[PDB]
Amino acid sequence: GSSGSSGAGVNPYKCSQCEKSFSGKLRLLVHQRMHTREKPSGPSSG
Ligand SMILES: [Zn+2]
């Protein structure tokens, strides 16, 4: 349970990477691919 739910989107699939979501399992996956990294662009931060 969550205390306070205003405008809580109702999607069957929600991108774990960002606050993205889709009504189709596929759409998500294909979208989750964008969050991929082949080479170490920048150094570690955070
Ligand atoms: Zn995403």
Curated annotation (Swiss-Prot):
Zinc finger (C2H2-type): 13-35
Induction comment: Down-regulated during erythroid differentiation by GATA1. Down-regulated by HTLV-1 Tax through the CREB/ATF pathway. Up-regulated by the regulator of nonsense transcript UPF1. Up-regulated by the cyclic AMP-dependent transcription factor ATF4.
Subcellular compartments: Cytoplasm
Superkingdom of source: Eukaryota
Tissue specificity as recorded in UniProt: Overexpressed in ovarian cancer tissues compared to normal ovarian tissues. Isoform 1 and isoform 2 are expressed in squamous epithelium tissues. Isoform 2 is overexpressed in squamous cervical cancer (at protein level). Expressed in blood cells. Isoform 1 is expressed in pancreas, lung, skeletal muscle, heart, placenta, liver, kidney and brain. Isoform 2 expressed in chronic lymphocytic leukemia (CLL) and several tumor cell lines. Isoform 3 is expressed in several tumor cells. Isoform 5 is expressed in fetal liver and several tumor cells.
Record function comment: Involved in the regulation of antiviral interferon signaling. During viral infection, recruits SETD4 to TBK1, leading to TBK1 monomethylation, which is critical for the assembly of TBK1 complex and IRF3 signaling.
Subunit organization: Interacts (via the KRAB domain) with TRIM28 (via the RBCC domain); the interaction increases ZNF268 nuclear localization activity. Isoform 2 interacts with CHUK and IKBKB; the interaction is further increased in a TNF-alpha-dependent manner. Forms a ternary complex with TBK1 and SETD4; the interaction between SETD4 and TBK1 is ZNF268-dependent and leads to TBK1 monomethylation.
Record's comment describing the protein's domains: The KRAB domain functions to reinforce the nuclear localization of isoform 1 in addition to its transcription repression activity.
Similarity comment text for this entry: Belongs to the krueppel C2H2-type zinc-finger protein family.
Entry protein name: Zinc finger protein 268
Natural source organism: Homo sapiens (Human)
Residues of the full protein shown: 831 to 863 of 947
